[model samples]
Target: AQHITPVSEKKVDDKITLYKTTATSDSDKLKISQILTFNFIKDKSYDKDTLILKAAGNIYSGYTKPNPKDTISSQFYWGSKYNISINSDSNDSVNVVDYAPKNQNEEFQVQQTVGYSYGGDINISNGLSGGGKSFSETINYKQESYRTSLDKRTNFKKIGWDVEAHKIMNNGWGPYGRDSYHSTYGNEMFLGSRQSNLNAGQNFLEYHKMPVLSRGNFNPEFIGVLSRKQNAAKKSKITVTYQREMDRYTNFWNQLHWIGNNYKDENRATHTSIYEVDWENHTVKLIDTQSKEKNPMS
Candidate 1:
């Protein structure tokens, strides 16, 4: 009789652990290579508060997916989460000062969350282009800055806006001392004054981006018509509006209101006050309209 042999089963896993680099020698530089494929959730939550970091290899496969000819392909993915707590004891007390990083080098991509509102994705490239043989759909595009705040909403509304706010009092002149001048009251201020004393924070939402349709058009385009539509929509525009300060104590008590009224003159011309102010009743209105001459001959 003849004996038979059995074959073993095989298993595979997509996840692989990354490693940290230490400056053990001159050639031991902290660099990662062949970072083609990595799991978003796995990589994002890997090895926090540790000196070592995980490295990924063989990201994806294709004729041009990852140029095997290139010795090394590098990619960096970064994310973080934070929590704060404060507590005081009878004899001992705790004090804390917080700082966050901003305006770093060229940001590949960023995802931000402001309170409960989740804003859309905003990509900002430093005017770099990749065309011809090295053409990349993710790159090569460029856009001019936005013009008026009004245009930001109607024209570039799909691109979204970046909200910025800063205290006007903090711009050099504040309740602190000048070169030789000192505050009549408060304590001697340091190089950077206290954050608490800052007031009159000016906040505005501004949009800066190339105006492109967020979604594709329903109608099909002919030979040159598509190019014309894209060219017409390429123009950039911006809009700015103030953010209400709900935290300001003075705003809740006694604050002046503003209103705007606009009307056009004869010949169907446009003109008027952009805003009308009614301080007595604490009311404001913004109006834009064309004037009626009552009689065209006049």
Candidate 2:
């Protein structure tokens, strides 16, 4: 009798587990539900049998400076304000059908829109010290962009996937900067100066799953002679990116995580230090990526 070989069946789960640290204590964790792209075939599959899904969207970015002319201003200054605005729109003008089978699923998506946004800085600067020569300046720019993406999925497995492309363009023109000088002669002395016009464009694209390994709130503790004398005087821009976590075993998107980008102070110094929370120990501390320094948080 010939020995018979039995084929072992493969086993897979409905979902996979993903881990991320959060600001909340180990005992209290938030779970935000998210749309799962995959269903099963969980454990393993051949490379040739994989499937994919795609999508696209626009991304906008820019910065604003209150008084570029202030760079040349001699002392005299009071208060200042800087503002930036951004908007986006899609060109798709038709209704998109749902992927489900004959379910009378009807929907219309408006692709065109004014994705408007605004932000900037405002205040009195002790750095600008002059008599009544205080001045104010304003700068503004408008740009447009477009993007698209494609995601991959297999047996309901929607791993971190994305495809995107965008461009930012600004025409050449001055009045990029405006100056208002105040002198003893008049409350508004004169149009101090203007920055030369500039034309530029930026492009970007990315496709990847960026999960949060750990997360926590942060406060830049500016402590020094100047920081104390000027009341911890510091000009800093903090950018943070927040995301929801999707755990493997649980099909829902739970837990919120955020990571800070490189912070730049008015001094032009870049600080990449951020708060790191230990989910297992309930300990939080600051870690500087540059020097690998760790400090306990209160």
Candidate 3:
């Protein structure tokens, strides 16, 4: 939890968190990403050595540069002792629960899982997958059709589920709630509406029933078949909302450093690209992405 100061205010910490395109692939498997935030602090005491970087009272990021400030302009620049040991980023902390935006015209995405976990698993639950609706399209990257075009490493593989799973799983924060503000289970009927096809007794596994799932194919316990009453209580409704790409910053909690960058040789700057996350089937369709830039820290 840091603050982004307005203009005219001196930055408190001028640190930037960089990430690797390794955990993610082709920048396309496009599962989840950090909502990058910059905390600009002019800790002259810490920078006095110019050999290391610190933020929020800890070593949040690490990098190297010419120590002599000028590097002798050539030949003799041995670079600042490579101050810190490089380590894998290894991070995410959704310590804070975010509220569903109510402003209609502001573009938003809300988790419609009202009561009960679909099966106690966030991934398989109605929150991320929104019931059986976009479940497949969500991971379509693993499908044969999209595999060739999606990120090579991910290819929409089963692990694809793991990535986003960890995201909403960040500190056990599930993107769930009713329509309006302060919404919760046992609140009202489907975001304050009482019309139509949203039934609480819906079964996803039954909806897209595979031919091979013969009568005895699945174990009751393993599949987590809910009791009749429980099924009627679980609302598998996820309001189809727009995805807002988030940015993340390294903090005292997660000392994430620059593992690597996809944007080669670029300094700390903002890059915006419209990544398509879809399906009415809600599939990630033809999203013409255009990434731009801005200095995160000055």
Candidate 4:
């Protein structure tokens, strides 16, 4: 495919709907719900305000100052207000749907627009006196808050999946498409700033499937970071896609309604299990908590 030039436009009230006319397999859906619930509740006591600072250097990242005008700095600074909360009574059962602009209103939301998420890279060799076989690498960071939709927090009633939207390529005022993107199920992905993976501490905390960590919890540890690229642009956007793991549990939706927990944090954990979900049915269950509630929302 040919590269499309970026447009400089803005849109409002565009619809992007996920579908679930039918639900997926129960067992598979239930399993995922359980995992999500465990992860969600486990994180509640922890501070959501510190997500960025906590995420720094966890995987392949380190600390760096945010741009004064950067959206992420603003978002993270904004999310610091509340401690992470858990809602056991949560639901997710719908197909991933989108109502492109031309259909709903005059201004259209681009259909499946995509692009690469930005991960600042530290080039150790740029000024290296390479006389010594010098080496360099890239690190990834979490998505800053500003890239998301304005009402994303409200759309889910402030109690459902943490919906975050990033536009990889936003044109001035025209319909546009994407190049490539990723949809993390529970949390946002973060890239680090250094060449060494020394920042793997907190990233592991957020990405791994550990029981809720209390002062008493302890586990063996392994650390490393993922490869990343340097990408930071004021106008470039990213499209992230995600699906729920709830609908499959069939009649067991209630049982899968984990208590003491609801709402999965999209921590950008790349476990292969994260992507597995039953899709035969129109709906999907996302078990990020432990409350007894209706399986499907409306």
Candidate 5:
């Protein structure tokens, strides 16, 4: 079972029991993270207390089917001008910050691998050497992130766009996931929230992941293909979006916090091997046209 081990949840202040995530020494998965301290206050503006953070991961899109190698593969994107945002719909707090990961190491860039979306594979093929019809299909994959659990939906629309506003100080969250498999934020984004000041209070939302990430299109034979009709669907392209939300908050403090995380893109090369068959010692190209994309939020 893959679960993010949060080091401590004790109070950093007298009135607030914070969600503190320090990628502890025992943690093998968390490669980069920073500490966040939230001071519970009543009279101060939330912005008065600020901590500049250094980013610690690569941002890009990656694809890999069920393969035992777990090797860092092909990347379709890199080095784009982007920014990040975090906000609370329950309150009127929003944060606009630059994503400056440390050194931009190669190790963290390979964590961006994405698998096929749920709903069985869409098989396509033309037995002969030259392929027959041009095909394409689009799928909306289930969004998952180490930050969201019970609420499988990791988008602001599902987790929530607005949060209860508060005037609390700096809060922090470090990243977590299985040592080998985890999702990554890949774009410049603004996690938006609106409100002047909130009617500060939290009811505590229930949410919860063990990821059998290694399990995927493990077809013993690349012998699958061509059953769907033409009008031939368009290429299969899926997008996986990730976001972070405040799990709980104190009534008086009226603050929302974020967690920490870092990951490189996934291994070697993205392949739709399910349609590629090596019969007669020759690799035959069956169906092609599909990609998995990633969005950054957490």
Candidate 6:
């Protein structure tokens, strides 16, 4: 399990001091050593309110498949359900923060919701009069520090546009603050929420992870492609659209509306797929499009 916790205090001196991480609880310490290699020797301090682990252990992502390495390997995993952060790491003590800990009977799991939403109202002078402001698939999203568990859906969105939006903000927002826009505002973007404010939220989806198909043709002997495809099809690939905030406000009152156009762009590509859906009657279809005789493209 891999987690990140901020130290209570941070300093920038010449040669930094160091701290050692230790677990008072034997079982917990052993657990921590199995999945992660923790380095606590750093000149970092924590305030009083800073959280300290009642026990000691490294965060662990639940096993999807059994592997001896998973149980014995000393590696870190950071997924939606399980993660940990090192709050303070010093010679005297080490404190940490964890989410979705396996042991639920423990004292507390601090809760806070983090959200990402579009910048503001999209204004058009003579554009239209029928509905509320609507932007494209992409808009500015503000940055926010996170402390709570987010739905797994957040782990899977193509984030190329979000990275571009950050580049736009390097300029400056307009005078009224709210009226400002990113450098690429009103341009053409496919995904993201733009904002007038300097956001702190992080887009975790790896945009650089190109599709496996993009690696070009495979000539067999890849050996495990069949099992890999099977696993991916059954497993849920969560997709979360970035939003400004989670609204807990009035339900009846009227608010802004948005209009967006849907465009179709099929990637002119070929691949072996055993999954399909027929919208005609709303049914699931499974076919091996990769057959050597039937799937020539493969």
lDDT of 3 at 224: 9
How much does candidate 2 score in TM-score? Answer: 0.17
Q: Estimate each model's TM-score.
A: 0.14, 0.17, 0.18, 0.15, 0.18, 0.14
Put down candidate 5 lDDT per residue, 1-298, tens digits, no spaces: 1122333333333432223221111111211111121111111112121111111221122112222221221111111111121111221121222111111211211122111111212232222222212211111111122111122222321121111111111112213222221223221011111221322221111111111111111111011011111122222211111111111111121233221121333222211111221111212122332222234222
lDDT tens string, model 1, 59-103? 010001111132211111110000111111111111111111112
- Residue range 126-182, candidate 2, lDDT tens digits: 222232211121111111121212223211211121111122121321211112122
Q: What lDDT tens digits, residue by residue, belong to model 3 across residues 167-243?
A: 11112232211111221212121111122122222211121121111111110000101111111221111111111
Better candidate number, 3 or 4, judged by TM-score: 3
Which candidate gets the maximum lDDT versus the true structure? 5
Model 1, runs deviating above 4 Å? 1-127, 131-159, 167-298
Q: Judge candidate 6 against the unseen true structure and give its global Cα lDDT, from 0 to 1.
A: 0.18
Distance from true location, Cα of 35 in model 6, Å: 8.7
Sort order, TM-score high to low: 5, 3, 2, 4, 6, 1
For each of the candidates, the C-alpha root-mean-square deviation to the true structure, in angstroms, is 29.8, 27.4, 29.2, 26.3, 27.3, 26.2
- Measured with C-alpha atoms, the lDDT of residue 25 in candidate 6 is 15
User: What does the lDDT read for residue 181 in candidate 1?
Assistant: 34
- Count of steric clashes across candidates, in order: 14, 26, 21, 76, 49, 27
lDDT (10s digit) by residue, model 4, range 177-295: 11122232112222221122222222222212211111011110110111111121111111111222111100001222211111222122111111122222212233222212133
Model 3: weakest 10-residue lDDT segment is: 74-83
Q: Who is ahead in TM-score, 4 or 5?
A: 5
